[PDB]
Amino acid sequence: SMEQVAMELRLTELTRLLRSVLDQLQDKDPARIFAQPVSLKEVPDYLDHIKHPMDFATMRKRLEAQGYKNLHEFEEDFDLIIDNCMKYNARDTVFYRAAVRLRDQGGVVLRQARREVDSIGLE
Numbered sequence: 540s541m542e543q544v545a546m547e548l549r550l551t552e553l554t555r556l557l558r559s560v561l562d563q564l565q566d567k568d569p570a571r572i573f574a575q576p577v578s579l580k581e582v583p584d585y586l587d588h589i590k591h592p593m594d595f596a597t598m599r600k601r602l603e604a605q606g607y608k609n610l611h612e613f614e615e616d617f618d619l620i621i622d623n624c625m626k627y628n629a630r631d632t633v634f635y636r637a638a639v640r641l642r643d644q645g646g647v648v649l650r651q652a653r654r655e656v657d658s659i660g661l662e
């Protein structure tokens with residue numbers, strides 16, 4: 540149907556916008572602390588602590604499968620990256636501090652993204 544094609548165009552468009560957001564958020568992690576999943580070879584007990592791991596590479600896979608239906612779903616995953624880190628690592632670590640900085644600097648990008656999604660009407 541034409542409707543299904545229209546839908547897929549918007550989803551494709553949403554994906555295009557979120558790819559830009561994802562690149563902007565990742566730039567706020569210059570140390571690449573959040574670029575890849577936490578290594579279960581290096582941190583063998585990680586899943587005893589964190590039940591829903593997330594990282595930028597995994598977000599990117601889902602993004603390219605057009606697996607984010609709306610901005611809220613994308614934001615949930617971003618929040619998992621930060622929130623997992625701020626629980627696993629103590630306040631006086633480079634890891635916790637990197638998450639705080641990513642949270643604070645990312646809020647700007649995400650505030651804008653929410654306005655653009657609403658405005659251009661991508662869902």
Ligand SMILES: CC(=O)N1CCN(c2ccc(C#N)cn2)CC1
Binds near residue numbers: 572582623624627634
């Ligand atoms: C982002 C995050 O929470 N991480 C947990 C702590 N972490 C570690 C810990 C121990 C070893 C070793 N060997 C390597 N990396 C980096 C990833």
Ligand code: NA
Binds near residue numbers: 625626627629
């Ligand atoms: Na903690």
